[PDB]
Design an enzyme around this catalytic site. Structure first.
Site, mmCIF file in Angstrom:
data_model
loop_
_atom_site.group_PDB
_atom_site.id
_atom_site.type_symbol
_atom_site.label_atom_id
_atom_site.label_comp_id
_atom_site.label_asym_id
_atom_site.label_seq_id
_atom_site.Cartn_x
_atom_site.Cartn_y
_atom_site.Cartn_z
ATOM 1 N N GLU A 35 0.851 -1.231 0.000
ATOM 2 C CA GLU A 35 0.000 0.000 0.000
ATOM 3 C C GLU A 35 0.864 1.250 0.000
ATOM 4 O OE1 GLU A 35 -3.091 0.491 -0.342
ATOM 5 O OE2 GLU A 35 -4.010 -1.437 0.036
ATOM 6 N N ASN A 46 -7.860 9.659 -5.042
ATOM 7 C CA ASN A 46 -8.717 8.768 -5.845
ATOM 8 C C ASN A 46 -9.609 9.561 -6.772
ATOM 9 O OD1 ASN A 46 -8.763 7.220 -2.729
ATOM 10 N ND2 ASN A 46 -7.794 6.231 -4.482
ATOM 11 N N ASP A 48 -12.845 9.618 -7.005
ATOM 12 C CA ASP A 48 -14.012 10.206 -6.333
ATOM 13 C C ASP A 48 -13.644 11.452 -5.518
ATOM 14 O OD1 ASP A 48 -12.864 9.079 -3.954
ATOM 15 O OD2 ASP A 48 -14.482 7.782 -3.532
ATOM 16 N N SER A 50 -11.611 11.556 -2.885
ATOM 17 C CA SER A 50 -11.140 11.132 -1.553
ATOM 18 C C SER A 50 -9.612 10.896 -1.658
ATOM 19 C CB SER A 50 -11.900 9.903 -1.084
ATOM 20 O OG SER A 50 -11.516 8.793 -1.859
ATOM 21 N N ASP A 52 -6.132 8.652 0.130
ATOM 22 C CA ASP A 52 -5.646 7.544 1.001
ATOM 23 C C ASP A 52 -4.358 8.049 1.700
ATOM 24 O OD1 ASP A 52 -7.720 5.872 -0.080
ATOM 25 O OD2 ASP A 52 -6.335 5.226 -1.538
ATOM 26 N N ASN A 59 -8.610 5.561 3.750
ATOM 27 C CA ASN A 59 -9.426 6.497 2.949
ATOM 28 C C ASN A 59 -10.222 7.553 3.696
ATOM 29 O OD1 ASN A 59 -12.185 6.838 1.000
ATOM 30 N ND2 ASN A 59 -10.265 6.833 -0.072
#
EC number: 3.2.1.17
Length: 129
Positions: A35, A46, A48, A50, A52, A59
């Site tokens: 990750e 991301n 959308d 959002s 991370d 998120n």
């Protein structure tokens, strides 16, 4: 901070992740590797809107507040920047809520596609734990 494999393994263990919800330590180290490459300061945006954050790429749509993810939840009750610290406590505390959410470690896409069903014990091989 960029963790070494065994150093992270020891910290996660200390924070009660070994076997948390039935997930051996190797699973958590494997997830962190893919990750964030063990970098607590990793961030990724991301589609959308959002983002991370941290070692476990948690998120902002549901778990932390970053003040720029319209109508998102903050289930971990923390600012997303807390997840970027050299101290992994917040990241671990939040990860425990996520893994208990019903989907287990499947919540982490890199775990599902690169760790799940592999010899995860290899991630802790040679460490003093």
């Amino acid at each position: 901070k960029v963790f070494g494999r065994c150093e992270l393994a020891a910290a996660m263990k200390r924070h009660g992740l070994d076997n948390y919800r039935g997930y051996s330590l190797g699973n958590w180290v494997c997830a962190a590797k893919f990750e964030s490459n063990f970098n607590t300061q990793a961030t990724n945006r991301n589609t959308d809107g959002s983002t991370d954050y941290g070692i476990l790429q948690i998120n902002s749509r549901w778990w932390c507040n970053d003040g720029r993810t319209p109508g998102s939840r903050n289930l971990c009750n923390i600012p997303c920047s807390a997840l970027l610290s050299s101290d992994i406590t917040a990241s671990v505390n939040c990860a425990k809520k996520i893994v208990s959410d019903g989907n287990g470690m499947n919540a982490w896409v890199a775990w599902r596609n690169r760790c799940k069903g592999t010899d995860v014990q290899a991630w802790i091989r040679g460490c003093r734990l």
